[PDB]
Design a protein around this ligand. Structure first.
Ligand SMILES: [Ca+2]
Ligand SMILES: [Ca+2]
Lengths: 174, 157
């Protein structure tokens, strides 16, 4: 596109009980991107959030693995996790703390993966995983807040959601 | 009339030398009135002249870059809302941007501090009010204070 977005996409939208579907959170063409906070909701009776790297079930302090950006320790990346898996809420954030250094070097990290989250299927009921607004993030864009290397809030980007995990609609092929 | 008094403080570590500035400057206002004061260097506040018939009232507690807090008080006379050994706590990290706070502690606040990360008192770009623990440097200790109450709203007090 060249168009700016944050996107959550699954490797598959169908599965059997006990399969782990991988949700990958990406950013695309976010100018001078330096950090984010996101709020992602799911139905915890249908899916269980699991760490695809460690194999552990998500807890409140689990930061999702898998990023390909915001990895340069020269700029002091800081992870924050504040999930509530029992209520089907993932809420986490990461940024370079030393944004002035990042800006000075001038090598932008505008596209890549920021999180991978496993979702273990508990039952075959059609369900959605999505970015959603939260009272703890006033003025966010569907529960997403992206930051540039000036430390300012970025606006104007699309929020791409994954297709419905239509697990309750799995008929035999005709 | 009614007088209300108490102590306000913070829940983070700071250098003993900075106590005076840490504990002072918390604004306390009686909602619906012009009665207000600011805390002194021990975190003490006192507001006199509250109407005696005003048997229920709200104290609005605030400070630049702190998450505001409302405390409801029931009674008349000489009322004590907290003590020096168990003060009312206000959480640092609802940071002003262009003179405006949004009444939430979250990543927007972390990133405001990050604008002046690694600065020290004396530097052109050091901002005293963003040095949350008032130790003369803006760094990961200040960011960690914000993160301690990440996603907090005034209802979580
Ligand atoms: Ca705030
Ligand atoms: Ca400091």
């Amino acid at each position: 596109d060249k168009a700016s977005s944050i996107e959550l996409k699954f490797d598959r939208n169908k599965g059997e009980v006990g399969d782990i579907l991988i949700g990958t959170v990406r950013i695309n063409n976010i100018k001078n991107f330096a950090g984010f906070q996101v709020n992602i909701v799911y139905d915890p009776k249908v899916l269980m959030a699991v760490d695809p790297e460690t194999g552990k079930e998500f807890t409140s302090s689990t930061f999702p693995p898998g990023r390909t950006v915001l990895k340069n320790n020269a700029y002091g990346p800081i992870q924050i996790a504040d999930n509530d898996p029992e209520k089907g809420i993932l809420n986490f954030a990461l940024a370079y703390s030393y944004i002035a250094g990042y800006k000075e070097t001038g090598v932008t990290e505008e596209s890549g993966i920021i999180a991978k989250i496993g979702f273990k299927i508990l039952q075959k009921k059609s369900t959605a995983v999505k970015f959603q607004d939260t009272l703890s993030m006033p003025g966010a864009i569907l529960g997403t807040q992206l930051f540039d290397w000036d430390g300012e809030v970025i606006t104007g980007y699309e929020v791409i959601q994954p297709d419905v995990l239509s697990l309750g609609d799995e008929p035999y092929e005709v | 009339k009614t007088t209300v008094s108490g102590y306000i403080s913070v829940d983070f570590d700071y250098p003993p030398e900075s106590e005076s500035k840490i504990k002072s400057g918390f604004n306390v206002k009686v909602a619906g009135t012009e009665l207000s004061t600011k805390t002194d260097e021990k975190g003490y506040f006192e507001i006199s002249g509250i109407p005696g018939d005003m048997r229920e009232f709200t104290l609005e507690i605030s400070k630049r870059n702190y998450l505001k807090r409302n405390v409801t008080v029931n009674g008349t006379g000489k009322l004590v809302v907290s003590t020096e050994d168990n003060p009312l706590i206000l959480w640092a990290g609802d940071v002003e941007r262009k003179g405006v706070q949004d009444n939430a502690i979250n990543m927007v606040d972390v990133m405001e501090i990050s604008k002046v990360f690694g600065t020290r008192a004396g530097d052109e770009e050091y901002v005293a009010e963003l040095d949350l623990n008032m130790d003369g440097a803006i760094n990961l200790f200040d960011i960690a204070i914000v993160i301690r109450h990440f996603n907090a709203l005034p209802s979580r007090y």
